[PDB]
Write a protein that binds this ligand. Sequence first.
Ligand SMILES: [K+]
Ligand SMILES: [K+]
Ligand SMILES: [Mg+2]
Ligand SMILES: [Mg+2]
Ligand SMILES: [Mg+2]
Ligand SMILES: [Mg+2]
Ligand SMILES: [Mg+2]
Ligand SMILES: [Mg+2]
Ligand SMILES: [Mg+2]
Ligand SMILES: [Mg+2]
Ligand SMILES: [Mg+2]
Ligand SMILES: [Mg+2]
Lengths: 740, 740
Amino acid sequence: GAAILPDLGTEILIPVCAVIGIAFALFQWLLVSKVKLSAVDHNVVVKCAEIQNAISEGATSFLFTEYKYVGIFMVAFAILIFLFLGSVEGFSTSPQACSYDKTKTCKPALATAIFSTVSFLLGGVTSLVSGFLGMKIATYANARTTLEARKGVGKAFITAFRSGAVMGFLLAANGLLVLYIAINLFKIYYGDDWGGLFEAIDGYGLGGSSMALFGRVGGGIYTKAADVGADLVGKVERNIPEDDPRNPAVIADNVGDNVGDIAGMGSDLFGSYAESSCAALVVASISSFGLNHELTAMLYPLIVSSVGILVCLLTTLFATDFFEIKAVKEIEPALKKQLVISTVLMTIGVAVVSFVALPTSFTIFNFGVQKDVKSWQLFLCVAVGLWAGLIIGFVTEYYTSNAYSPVQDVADSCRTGAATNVIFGLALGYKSVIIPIFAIAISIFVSFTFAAMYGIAVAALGMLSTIATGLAIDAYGPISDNAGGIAEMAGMSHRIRERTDALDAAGNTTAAIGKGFAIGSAALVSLALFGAFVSRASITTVDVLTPKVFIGLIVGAMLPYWFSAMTMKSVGSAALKMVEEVRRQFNTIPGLMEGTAKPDYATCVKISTDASIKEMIPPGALVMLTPLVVGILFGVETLSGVLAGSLVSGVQIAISASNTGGAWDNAKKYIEAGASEHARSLGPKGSDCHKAAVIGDTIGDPLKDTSGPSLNILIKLMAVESLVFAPFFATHGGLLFKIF
Amino acid sequence: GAAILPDLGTEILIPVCAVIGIAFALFQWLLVSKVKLSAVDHNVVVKCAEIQNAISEGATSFLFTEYKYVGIFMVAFAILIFLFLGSVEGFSTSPQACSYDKTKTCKPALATAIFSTVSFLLGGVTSLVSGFLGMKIATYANARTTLEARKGVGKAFITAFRSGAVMGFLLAANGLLVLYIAINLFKIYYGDDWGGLFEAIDGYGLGGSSMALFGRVGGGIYTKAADVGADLVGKVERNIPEDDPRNPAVIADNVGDNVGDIAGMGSDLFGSYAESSCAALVVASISSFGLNHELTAMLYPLIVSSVGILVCLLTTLFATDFFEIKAVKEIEPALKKQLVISTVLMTIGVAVVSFVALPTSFTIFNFGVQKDVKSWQLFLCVAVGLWAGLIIGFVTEYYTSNAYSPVQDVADSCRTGAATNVIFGLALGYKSVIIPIFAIAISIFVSFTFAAMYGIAVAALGMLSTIATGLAIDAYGPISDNAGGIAEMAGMSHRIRERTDALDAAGNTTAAIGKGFAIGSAALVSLALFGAFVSRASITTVDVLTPKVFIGLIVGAMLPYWFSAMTMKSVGSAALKMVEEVRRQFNTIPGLMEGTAKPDYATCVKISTDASIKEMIPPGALVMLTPLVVGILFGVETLSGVLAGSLVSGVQIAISASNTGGAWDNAKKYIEAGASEHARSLGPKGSDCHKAAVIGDTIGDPLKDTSGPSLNILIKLMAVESLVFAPFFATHGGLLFKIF
Ligand SMILES: [K+]
Ligand SMILES: [K+]
Ligand SMILES: [Mg+2]
Ligand SMILES: [Mg+2]
Ligand SMILES: [Mg+2]
Ligand SMILES: [Mg+2]
Ligand SMILES: [Mg+2]
Ligand SMILES: [Mg+2]
Ligand SMILES: [Mg+2]
Ligand SMILES: [Mg+2]
Ligand SMILES: [Mg+2]
Ligand SMILES: [Mg+2]
């Protein structure tokens, strides 16, 4: 049954919304361009511009190198997709009867193999663009945030936030537009074969997350090598300020914020948005929407996202135009209010979309059967994802902000040395998983009960319906981070660093929240994708108490630990190298420590470049080889276990790692700031307590910036990879069992 | 089909072996008594005995206190077993159809509710006795190991190993004898109802692990509060030797070794032994062995354990009589030979038992169907468990001994400070899980394929078939640990401390191996119990892709993290208080640092005492309340998800935690001994590298001695607890779904 909103209306609405989002991004960039600087107080302005250029150059240079390797891997893997999918039906060009309707004829499997390859490359390119554009605005907005900090913490906040909004709206609108275009283009070939249309379109998220994996891990290793090295020798050893221009690692550190926390994060969340959308589309395509060719209801997830962009635009105006920050204590609540307002506004918006873009009754594919579903039930499916997100955001704030007791007790434990700081920090992260898990569990139960895998996929999208705002508050952080780095490097007044420090602490919490959203939506979309895989692979039942499934389960649960071992070890080894280099320069360049000789920044940049480009390979291979090795050797039943295991296990370590690291960072910020008697009693900077906090922070660096956040990609990527390769595994896989 | 060994032979063989094992343990205690000392070099022996008495008193005092609370808890919980199990049949006194065969009449459920309570209390008491006896021999042989260290390493090794043997054989023999006795007594009532007999007997393992959970957590919190406190103030802050008698936390530290690493560990492994034996018994009881009332084959597990005692006795003779240690490098291989020799001899033993105590063909219950199994197939089930163990031991030795690169690299990373030491340590533990998981997975596949749940249960018992030797090599460690503590506290020669340090380092490795066997066997037995739970609860299929099972799965995966948060935070807070107290004594008691005034040990003993008794409660509650809360509220489908996720997730954090902790300890021992130039280059004691290693070591302390090893109990305990209450949950549970 047709919805109120006709198909042509949907066809107009979606790109209009994307255009509006792109326009809004450009406008914000324009407003930020009003902050002027150049390399040609004149001296402070000039110095900021020079440091900005060093950072910009370093960041652009790394991504080109990273993206060159990743893009080569992408072409290699696209060929694998083509051959494996094509081999299912012997590359025949002959049409076959639709698996979703024997009375109809569908396009050849071969076409789906081709178009899956196309959408995969599309997703990879779009994901690269997401990270690059993010890096561009971040490296443009950093120094401008620094200069605005001369006028106060509120002005600086607005520059960093407007700029964060540039990234969020660009990424959400571009991701939406590309998907919309691909669908209309692919439809020209597929015609009424919507099952094949959307199965092919599903490659988009596969490409998105494939590149995101390397961007997150590569970017992650680069930044943490520099970060740990700079901080340990500078702050713990040499008793100099963080980001001091004498420190040879400071440039790599600040470049790192852009290539990891920005570019990597950007590709990462694009993968999230793409997979959730695509997962909804596949299930709907063989549900009544796709069967009755009802375009509007079929594109329900895209309409939700179209409205999300608009909702986030309005929300943004509240922080950008309706409220002023005057005191440091107002930053975190400002940020939180963006999550609150957008959620409330999006609840309404989702109700509107459910009311006008769905028929009141319809059916959803449910493991071979068409399940009767009502539109108010779908509304609750996406709304439960939306509200799970907000809950995750609140709990994550409680655990990572130095405004609350958990982080303050972590800082407090520094009184008894680094070891107690680490014990308290590990305990905090472990403890922090409880409510997000419960939130995710509730979201699963509601959405699974109402609309099976579609409901779940649409819950994932619900959690990411406010993605423009999520990205904005998140990207705000590394920009603020760079601003303090630039302030120190340019020798600005201590008042400037205090303001940036306030901004930066809030970004710590905000980064932990973004990670919570990414993990939450990854669990959701991966479960949806798990169910879809099972159908696509002709599995009747995934029975945990069979030998094949159970070994998959316990092995899948182990993968996130293997992945974490590799990434942690990489950062550890590179940082060890970094410390040796930094020590060397301090110990052997005359005048360096005295400030009359300049350090060699390039050598540190090279160390984090070499380690990242090299060491991103094995964990990337682990994730993407796993479904192929398990699918081909052991078959779809064992692979089923693996998917379930990696999901339920990976999620726990991802959450605890990110929050522990976030907590160590803000525990350190708390001591550095001395904004209360308790904080001051832990100081001043350089005290044993401070140094214990720095130890904790640097241990948390790879936890929250390399392994932790990348785990959500491990999960969601194997999930979509297995779905895309399901027919191939079902037909040609399980060799070990076929032999014996 | 009867086997070659008649029922009467089996009835005689089992206690004969137990008694032999008891005799052998007593013989060893005797040879150890040959080493003489008394508080009535003369002044060294006297001081050694006054110190031994101080430790013995503190350990006995805490155990009584701890056991007081646990026993009280044990009685309360026993009342729940009676009521809940009794409620299944409305406390009827009438017989009813067999749950395994409705054509037959069985003993009333109410009877089984009573015999379950009896076996529960029996197991609890036997678990208490297990811990207590271990503590007795350990606090007896510690000073004897010290005094004998005056004559060389070999001499001190033997005393420590003989004493470890006492605990290993007493525990194994006693655990067997009690089980055997309880089976014969219970059979008096049950007659031909063997299903009901062994269903009731299954309470034995429930009592054993229930009470072990508190013993591992309570003892673990006690010991680690002292350990972290003593080491941070003494070694990191005040630059004095480890175990220095001036340190007021040193008595609590050394008491703790016996109270956690010995008593808690002993209960822990008794729990492992009992659950494995019992789980095999419940499946077999409704297989052909139980239905045909063939006593020999039905007691296959107890006959395996009986031959295990004999094999281990033979194995012990090799380290004890046939060989001796001249060089410290011979210690670790000596202990590993115990594992290799016992594994090989037991392979032969299990072959013989399989050949003489089983019919060549029989059936194994398999989710309703009687499955045809051959004796050679059962042989491989127990053998694959046995060999999985040896593999796990080798891999664990590789990751925790400082004779190999991973630990040496971790020690090396100390050159760049505590933060790199910690990052490397975390990475190592994450890495160490790969092969054990694979070993476990292979064990599952083989045993599940051949003989379903019975096969898996029997793989679990195979891994624990050399439990006496396993316990010997492990218990050897803390005895050595204490011996070095006594050496330092008695101001003995530096050369004495060097010898015990060598003994101690090996003990760290064997303790990590012990934990691996416990985690390996816990995975196996819990999977077997899981399957049995599913049958007993009348679940047709555990379908991962249902709302009820999946929310169980993800939540159950979260539980080990929640458990770790509690236990890590408890140690952190307790250790923090300890540090403050030790500082207080050093800063306010005149003459203390100088050596002319005595420190108040009692205050430190009180800190760890108070913290442990209080803080053992909530994690105990979490583990014990979970099956009841989920089973009653959500039902057996959800609890099924919980059990699966708990197992596959908990195993990863358990292995990684114990091995990380072990690694940091031995990295530290490596630097402390300086037995190579690389080791010496990181020294000497008090260096920045040494201090960085001590930081890592004290972070690892709660990881490997509180949270990590208790995690295996969390898994195996919820597993039996679920099976025992299965009829109850199946009848009266799932309330939330029955209402709305
Ligand atoms: K940040
Ligand atoms: K030990
Ligand atoms: Mg830093
Ligand atoms: Mg940074
Ligand atoms: Mg920074
Ligand atoms: Mg930060
Ligand atoms: Mg950092
Ligand atoms: Mg210690
Ligand atoms: Mg100790
Ligand atoms: Mg010790
Ligand atoms: Mg030790
Ligand atoms: Mg220790």
